[model samples]
Target: MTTVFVSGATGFIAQHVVRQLLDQNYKVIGSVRSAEKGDHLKNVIFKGGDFNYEIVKDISDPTAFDHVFEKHGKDIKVVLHTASPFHTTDIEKDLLIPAVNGTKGILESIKKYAAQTVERVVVTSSFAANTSTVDMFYAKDSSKTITEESWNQDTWESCQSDPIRGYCGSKKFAEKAAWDFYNANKDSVKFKLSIINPVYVFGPQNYVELNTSSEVINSLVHLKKDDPLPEFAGGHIDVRDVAKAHILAFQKDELIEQRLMLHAGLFTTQTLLDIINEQFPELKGKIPAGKPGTGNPDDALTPVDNSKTKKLLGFEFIDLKKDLYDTISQILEAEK
Candidate 1:
């Protein structure tokens, strides 16, 4: 069986990645920050999975993987490094260390453990790594719709204008650091490394966790009920698809040093609101009033090019409307 080790085993996206790996019949070993959380994760994602769970919790320490490495040894064929700090609040010391240090630790572990039998590694990156400017071109290259080749160099100063932009900058730095590590280790390590960048990932959760998508949906509902809709990320995809892509990259043969920029579809706040309004115009009053510029947050048009991932995996995206609505319904049902 193809065995894989996944870091950030309890994260929103990592949980879904674990579920997809399970479906593929790959033996999975996951690392959580705490054993208590590992128990819950195992119960949730590994209920019927032929998988193992380990709790080291300290992704910042490269030595933590020793326990996992000693037990799993050469059995681990792939490693999915998905854990990283993410927040939209202040981007100070509190939020920066975990993001940078955690990345450093994982790369160190790969250096130590992957030399033996690990064949491939897929790092979870974000579109934030691609472009910090929403709804605008990075340069004069309109042909380049925020592809993996494009890098977001928007500094802290550039992002200090807004909290959300600042958050994107943090992601950019983390992803850059991952790329730097990959470049340093690619020649020395036996495994192949690829980065997967996604935008506004949504869909059903593998476990009960309030993820970025869940929070975004809740905010949308609040607008549907009372609060006005604010402009946000315009593109999104099913979390399942994102999860599946990671595993596909891990299992596929002989991947080059490439990045997969996969986004489900392009959608605006108005576009999403219209979908809701079509079903329930009574939600009009509840929905945010007017277009994006009407005191709404800065509207960014994230019309990303996702063809690379699709072409590589021989897969297409799930319909956004059907998938998102079903997810929303499921979350609401679970609430009640």
Candidate 2:
């Protein structure tokens, strides 16, 4: 049996990834922090499948996956490193160390124990790992185009100026370390490394309590109509597409040793609010009526050359209208 191991199996993207893997009939061993959390995936969400859980309490420790790999390395054929601290308050304590160590820890553990059986490794990085400081932070130049080759140019010390920067540094450094690890150990290990970098993921989750990019919609749903919409215009991709790219990473050998950017287009707060009001009549008065016809962010945001990523994946992303409709429908159902 071809077995797969996914770190952070309870995460937003990771949950979708595990679901897809189970649909394909692969034996999945997911890492979770506790039995209660693991049970949450099995009983409440997943509810039983060709899936099981493993204990990995401290993802920040370099040796976190030692026992997991030691036990399941021989059976494991795929590894998806998706565990990382997304929400953070402190730089080193919460974000940087956890992001970097979790990535490195998984790779090293694989190389040490699962090297013989593992055929592929997929890392879940983000769009935060790309773009220059000015392009992403201060002035988002729409003229600036980010391809798979681009990397965010913020150093560790420079990122400490703000928590967002710290978040970026966390993603940037973690992805970099993964690339470096694979490059150095390419000859020793048989597995090839593939990376997935997604931007502002939107779409519905299976459960009511959402997290990460999906939380954007959750927050907007709770916002007052009179409140001004958010000004940040970031690139977007549906969470389903992002999850597909992760599964596709190991399935297609052509995607090996490469980073596939899962960016569909750009969206602003106005973009989301506009979609909400137009699609759902009930939410018309509840959501902020941001500058109605001014939602498109192509004018203010950095352009993404997504042709190569789309080409590599051989698929089109889910439409913004459809994805948002599903998200809002779920939210509305929960409220009623």
Candidate 3:
């Protein structure tokens, strides 16, 4: 069986990655910040999984992964480094530094301890790294599809003023740091590198703790009856799809040094509300009031071309309605 080391094993995306790995009969050594959470994940989320966890509270620490890799390096065949801060008020201190250094720390550890056993390292990036402007989604330029080639033009200076943009810049710079490290050390490092850049991801939860992306659907279900439906614009992709993309990145060596963009299609808050009402009318009072097709067309979400991913990974995407229904149904059940 393939032995894979996954950082941030309890995260929203990482949970799904762990699930898929076990389903494929792979052995997974997951890194978490706490042994308490690690035990909870094993007992609750992966009861029968061929999985074990290590506690590494600080990802930014230069030696965070040294011991874990040194002990398990000989058995580990791949490394999926997915741990990074998603939201923070202090951009530079909390998000930016942790994001960049955490990535570097993982690469450095792999180089020093696991280079011989680890054949590939797959990192989770985001579409935020590719987008230059917030409204690039609504731009008239039909040629603005966010592909693997695109990179966010927002800088640390410009993003320091806005928290939202700061998150985007953090992802941008963090991903760039990974590529830079790979290029600079490719000759010396034994493992190849691949980056998975996914847009807003939604799907059934493998664990009870909900992250920001999953919380979006939860917020909708619990909205007051009289509340106006929220408006959100962005490309959407299923969590399972994103997880599979990460695994595929390692399985196919041709994907080395490639940035794979994972997106299903355009999604909006209005569409989600409609899907909820249609699927679960019993929760009518809790549902938000909104028209089926009403949304700001000029502010509509951007599109993404996943053809390259489809051809390379050999899979089809889940339908939007199906994705939302699964997500909402799971939330409703979890609430009870």
Candidate 4:
């Protein structure tokens, strides 16, 4: 059986990628923080998945992945480096250090330990790496169009201005590091590299943990009629599709060293509100209505071209309304 090693297997997208891999009958070894985390994946999550875990808890550590790679090097043929910190609290400690370090560290480990066996690497990047702060937040016209070749130019100083910028910078630099590593050693390295840059990922979770995290859709689930809405604005791709993109990286040869920018279309808080009201009439008067027909204006979004990625993946994207419908339905049923 093909063997794949996934770092940060406990993450939102990582879990789904692992699920897809295991279901496809790959022998999967995932990195998690503790034994409990590992056991939960095999017993609780997948119900006897061909999944195993090795603890490399602190991804920020310089040698975080060395031991795991040393042991599993020969067995693993594909690597999905999907672990990164997502926090608004401290950019240095909570964001960049782990993301940049973990990215570089794993590549170092793979080259040192698995150079002969691993043939493909997929890194979980985000649209944060492909966007600019001004164009993402303030663009009112289609003047700024992000393409497969686009890159975010936020510097450490520039990103320090806001938490959102911090996230964008973290993703960019981390993904940049991976590409840089591959570029410098392409002739010598054994594996090809691919990057998956997903936009504001939405859709139902494969399974939600007991204490819910506050992502865009999850935060909106609790919205009350009179409550003020969060000014959330961005494009979206289904989590299932994002998971598939990670798999596609190794499955397709044309995508070598390419950034698969995953996005369905632009959306704003009103788009979500409209979906909630129309899709679930039971929540109509109970949830925030904002205005009946007003989401952010069309001009307010940065136009992104994902045609290449769409054609390459070669499948119809999950409908936005259906994604919201599934997410909302699960939340409503699980609450009681």
Candidate 5:
């Protein structure tokens, strides 16, 4: 069995990736900045039944990887970095360092210590890094979706236009750094780099009633219970699909030297509202309708071309109706 090291082991995506890895019976080592945070991964990962855990957190710490790499040495062959300092509030001091410095820290260590034995590195990047403005959507040429070929430049242009600049800049720069690091050290460090771009990742979470990814759900659920359904756009993907894609990307040798994008499918908030209200009549007419020719305040980013992520990983997403109800049911079950 190949021993793999995962960074950000306690995150929503990391938890799913760790669980999937354990189910496949792979020996896993994950990073935790502190024992307290590492405990989260330990509890969740152990539920998948038994795997080795390590505490070498601090992606932002330039020298932390050295300790982990030397300790694990050639035994570790892969790394899945799903640690994105993701958040809605745009605090520069707290967010910028982790976004920029942490990425540099990870790459620096990989370039210096990760030798030929390490074959692949899968990084968790975001669609937000694809464009600075929604106008980039116009360049699609009837494609109606964006993909891996797209990259965001608006971040460098303004960086302060929206509340999510820290996130956009960090992911944009980090991914660029990953590419640059890979290119500069290809001969010395021949590892393939693949990025997973997921939109509004949902479905099961740490608990049924509460989820780290529930901000949108909180809004949607509120609309279902009290407010009117709103109009929104973009896509949704099951957390399971995101986890499975990472595993497939890690395991597939054919996918070497590829940049991929995974999209669940395009559907707006109104579509989601319709799906939910239609399925559960009790919630009908409660979803706020978008003002004429306007979108809901809840919708974030719009849809992109997911064909590459789909074809690359052979992913098929769950239906919107079923996905929502399943989420509600899970939360309800967790309540009991």
Candidate 6:
């Protein structure tokens, strides 16, 4: 059986990737920060499967993955790098270094040590990487659509103090470094690079511990009837679809050099709440009762082309209502 090495194996996104890999009959080696988390992941998230983990606490370390490659280099057929600082206060120290260097570190190790065995590397980049600061949250023009070709102009210097902007820059630069490393070593490096840029991932949690990304939707549970729904644009994608994209990126020959932009549709918080209210009328009194807000007319976002993703990946996305229903259901179940 083929073995895949997954960085951040215990994370929200990585856990789904691991489960999907197991379902496809692949042995997985996940990277975790501690043995306790690793054990919990294996026991709770991945109860019984061909899954083992390496304790990689500090992803920013230049030589962090050196030993992992030396030990499992010969067996690993693919590397799914999803380990990067997601939440942090210090942008340069916490987010930037780990995001940028961790990507370079893993690729460098793969090129130097595991190039003989590894065939491809799939990185989990965000939609933040694909949007510019001027047009990320809200659109400047209602006619422009974001695609794989779009690159974020957010700089580290400018976004250092702001958490949201800093994360956008981190993902942007991390993905850029992966491409840069691959280009510089294209002649010698044996592996191909594929990137998945997903927007606002929401779905059921896989582990006992919750992920920060889910908080985007989880926060909605607290909104009172009078509280205005948050204004968010760009788009949203289901976590399961994002996981499927990663697996497809590895399995498909056509996606070897592709940078996939994964999104289901443009959505606002109000759109999601309306779906909730419509689907589960029991929550009418409990959930928020406000209607969708009509923000600045000029700020409306344009529709993006997911046809390429659908064609290349050979799958349709889950419906937004179903996605939202499942998400709320999971959250409610967990609380009980």
Number of the predicted model whose lDDT against the real structure is largest:
2
Cα RMSD for candidates in order: 3.8, 2.1, 2.2, 1.9, 3.8, 2.5
Stretches of candidate 4 exceeding 4 Å from the true structure: 86-90, 137-143, 210-214
Clashing pairs in 3: none
lDDT of 2: 0.82
Task: Give the clashing residue pairs of candidate 6, or none.
Answer: none
**Order of candidate numbers by lDDT, starting with the best:** 2, 4, 3, 6, 1, 5
Model 5 residue 111 lDDT score: 64
Clashes of 3: 0
Residues 1-336 of candidate 1 have per-residue lDDT tens digits of 878899888877888888888887878888887878888877865788876788876665546677776667678878898877545345645344455666656666657765757777788878877887653433334565666677876775666567667767767777777778777877777777788888877787776551235566666767644455565544677888888878777767734556787677766566666555554444566666445333221234534666666777788888767766666666656766
Per-residue lDDT tens digits for candidate 2, residues 1-336, read 688889999887888898888888788899999999988877777766777899888888889899998998888889998887546456877888787887888889988988877899999999878764456533355456788888988887787778878887889999999998888999888888999998888887745662234767767777798876655578778888888899999999889987899888877888878888889998776777877888567666667787888999999999889988887787677666
Q: Candidate 5 — what's its lDDT?
A: 0.67
* lDDT agreement with native, every candidate: 0.70, 0.82, 0.81, 0.82, 0.67, 0.80
TM-score of each: 0.84, 0.94, 0.92, 0.94, 0.84, 0.92
lDDT of 6 by residue, 197-281 (tens): 9888887766544123577676677767777766665577888889989999998899998889888887766677777788878
lDDT of 4 by residue, 1-336 (tens): 998999888887888899899789888999999999988887788776788889877887768899998988889999998887535567766787777887878888988898878899999888888986666754554456688888997886687677778878888888988988889977767999999998888766776671233278766767777888988887888888889889888988987788898888888888888888899998777778788677753656777778998888788888789877776777777777
Task: Give the lDDT of residue 5 in candidate 6.
Answer: 92
lDDT (Cα, tens digit) per residue for candidate 5, span 34-153: 787666556754556555566765566656677777777678788887875434454455555566666656666766776767777888877666654443334335453456777776
* lDDT (Cα, 0-100) at 182 in candidate 5: 75
User: After superposing candidate 6, which stretches have Cα over 4 Å from the reference?
Assistant: 86-90, 137-143, 208-213, 292-299
Report the poorest 10 consecutive residues by lDDT, candidate 4. Answer: 205-214
